[PDB]
Amino acid sequence: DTKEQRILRYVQQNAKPGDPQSVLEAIDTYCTQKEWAMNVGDAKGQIMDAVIREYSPSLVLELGAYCGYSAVRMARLLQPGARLLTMEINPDCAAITQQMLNFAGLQDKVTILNGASQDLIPQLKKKYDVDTLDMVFLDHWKDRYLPDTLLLEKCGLLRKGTVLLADNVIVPGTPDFLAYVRGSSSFECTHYSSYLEYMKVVDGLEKAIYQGP
Numbered sequence: 001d002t003k004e005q006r007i008l009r010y011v012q013q014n015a016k017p018g019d020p021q022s023v024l025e026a027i028d029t030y031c032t033q034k035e036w037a038m039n040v041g042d043a044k045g046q047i048m049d050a051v052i053r054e055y056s057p058s059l060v061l062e063l064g065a066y067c068g069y070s071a072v073r074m075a076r077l078l079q080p081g082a083r084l085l086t087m088e089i090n091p092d093c094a095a096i097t098q099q100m101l102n103f104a105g106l107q108d109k110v111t112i113l114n115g116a117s118q119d120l121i122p123q124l125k126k127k128y129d130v131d132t133l134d135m136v137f138l139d140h141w142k143d144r145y146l147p148d149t150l151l152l153e154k155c156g157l158l159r160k161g162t163v164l165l166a167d168n169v170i171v172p173g174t175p176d177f178l179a180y181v182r183g184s185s186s187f188e189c190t191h192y193s194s195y196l197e198y199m200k201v202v203d204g205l206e207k208a209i210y211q212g213p
């Protein structure tokens, strides 16, 4: 089996069905004690929580589900009726994410889409009936943060006040994205310094609030 399968099994055997907090704690324990994995982690996850609670978004898009850690973390704080769409290119990870969400009891709040963000983003309006997004969490291939931001704008998916929250702006880093948003009058940016998941290595999140064209 793969590391992602091992994380899923660990959750199923060490968390309580229907209890998202227990799911997060199980993943963080496994990744601290057994095998590192690229989940956002508890340090950065607490910053994410604080953001989600501030904005109470009704429709969130996540680019890069992986095993569903951040999807569980965000979806557990959404208000009744609010929804998360998450895009994952790797089909094995998409399946693990769906099972993770099912275990956590969050499947009715989240839609996990298996595919490349650049192909799925242009379908969101017509196929998935999206008007505009309240929040976007960027956590996919670091090279894709900037092109996919520009694509979201082109497709009319951003509105005044849409919150972009980007993981890994230090490690591995996303230098073109970061330079772009920090230099653009269309975004108001804030940097949240933190640590790489499960490591004593500095990392951070960037929040970039869209201001319109």
Ligand SMILES: O=C(NCCc1nnc(-c2ccc3[nH]cnc3c2)[nH]1)c1cc(-c2ccc(F)cc2)cc(O)c1O
Binding pocket: 038, 039, 040, 063, 064, 065, 066, 087, 088, 089, 090, 115, 116, 117, 118, 139, 140, 141, 142, 144, 167, 168, 171, 172, 196, 197
């Ligand atoms: O590469 C990362 N994350 C991205 C996974 C991905 N790779 N493929 C996708 C996708 C999902 C839909 C997509 N749609 C279009 N492209 C897509 C790509 N997602 C990543 C890496 C690290 C990391 C840090 C230090 C190290 F020493 C090694 C690694 C930490 C993190 O927190 C990460 O998030």
Ligand SMILES: [Cl-]
Binding pocket: 038, 039, 040, 041, 065, 066, 067, 068, 069, 070, 071
């Ligand atoms: Cl994650």
Ligand SMILES: [Cl-]
Binding pocket: 040, 041, 042, 043, 044, 196, 197, 198, 199
């Ligand atoms: Cl952590």
Ligand SMILES: [Mg+2]
Binding pocket: 038, 039, 040, 139, 167, 168
């Ligand atoms: Mg990440």
